[PDB]
Amino acid sequence: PIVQNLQGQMVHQAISPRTLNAWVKVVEEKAFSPEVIPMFSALSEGATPQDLNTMLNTVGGHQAAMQMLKETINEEAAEWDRLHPVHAGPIAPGQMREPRGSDIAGTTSTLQEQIGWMTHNPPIPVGEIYKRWIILGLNKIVRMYSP
């Protein structure tokens, strides 16, 4: 995640193993139950896309759901690209590039790039955009997996 250091700057720090394991354990115990979404939300505080793929990729089991989510993440990403067209002409030397759906999904962007966008002024909340897609896709799952 990207956290504020004592000095008063935003720097990246790694997520903790008993945080990781707590994510694992939630999924083990409460599967598709709604409490998973606030839980997720708390444990995703200050998290990167990269950390969010890590959390999704580290799941075991419920592979039908994991595929449905993936496909929702790509749909929501396809929709990001649709709604926000690429911008006019070449990229400025003085500036950094606008993200695509796949940069938001973490796929085409690097960590330093993910830190550029979030730490820069104005900052862009690429975590929160992926977060809604995850929560939206979580609703899809919850609604389906209701019996």
Partner: protein, 74 residues
């Protein structure tokens, strides 16, 4: 399971039923106004005859602690 399929047993305490209702209501994502409509309507409708009778005597304006204490012996 759908919200319409939530119903109170003939021997099931209301209490255990009301818990089931706001759990399933917890998985409904509808506007609040619709969910208010569901609350006053569907809950009583799928309640068992013995408690249903009881709840009809509370009249309208009733709140959950009073409904929950009203159908306790049933």
């Amino acid at each position: 399971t759908s919200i319409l399929d939530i119903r109170q047993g003939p021997k099931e305490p209301f209490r255990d039923y009301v818990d089931r209702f706001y759990k399933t209501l917890r998985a409904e994502q509808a506007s609040q106004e619709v969910k208010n409509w569901m609350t006053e309507t569907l809950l009583v409708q799928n309640a068992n005859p013995d408690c249903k009778t009881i709840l009809k005597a509370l009249g309208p304006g009733a709140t959950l602690e009073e409904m929950m204490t009203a159908c306790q012996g049933v």
